[PDB]
Design a protein around this ligand. Sequence first.
Ligand SMILES: CN(C)[C@@H](Cc1c[nH]cn1)C(=O)O
Length: 320
Amino acid sequence: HMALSLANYLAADSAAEALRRDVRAGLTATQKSLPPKWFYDAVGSDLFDQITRLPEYYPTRTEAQILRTRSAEIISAAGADTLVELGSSEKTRMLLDAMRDAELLRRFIPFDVDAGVLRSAGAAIGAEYPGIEIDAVCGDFEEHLGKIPHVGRRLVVFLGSTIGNLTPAPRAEFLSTLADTLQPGDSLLLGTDLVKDTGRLVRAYDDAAGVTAAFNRNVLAVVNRELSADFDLDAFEHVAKWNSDEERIEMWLRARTAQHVRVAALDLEVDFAAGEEMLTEVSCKFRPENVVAELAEAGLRQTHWWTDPAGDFGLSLAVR
Ligand SMILES: CN(C)[C@@H](Cc1c[nH]cn1)C(=O)O
């Protein structure tokens, strides 16, 4: 039902400030870009949820299968009574069920950008696990990790390879910051999508049904609405690329003809040449050996490594 603690560090004026800043900088760069965090308004979050069920998008179900078959082992290794989830599901329940089965579950700490979603989880989870304490935190995981409570022995999970949506420099910064908040008896469960057949990688971000394309183009709808811009969404083509040098998927939006875009709120006018491409997201893919090193660099020791038989996806347990 309604039992909940919820702390909110996301102000609408701060969000507006950041978007203006991001869009001005991104659209005036010789190589245009937009940060992917702006994908996730209500519509875009819905579209991502649909992406997780696409035939081509293996990551969610691959990760879920690993959690499904190793839930007990993960929870036994963590020895936690508190689950901290950065980014909010079926995956969630597997972990919580295992903690409950082990008679360890005391507390659930969801960390997400949408307070509404957090409130819904508080009710659902509160109902599913009677007596559980729920302390929700509305924040962005790049700035408010220090606001996460430290009560209990905490299993901090960052699933879905969302860590791959940060380029190396901010990624290392995030991991270090996160590691610094862990006490003895705390653990990090990190999901990393792994280097694999490049055809499979591109198809996962360029599905036949055009759902990912809609997800990508929606960032233009967000800008149109929030900054009073006039992007013609239909004029932009969805492009997914494998960058072999950086070993990352990239999502681009390509102007199929010359476009003139006015962003009224920024007193800004911007031009796209025919065939000009704008970078909207990276999805970095990892090699198993490099996951160990990136954790070590952040001050975390990898104590467990779970991966599906095909080696498509990896889950790390790590501690200070
Ligand atoms: C959120 N992150 C894990 C997703 C974002 C995504 C999914 N499809 C397109 N972009 C990924 O990089 O796979």
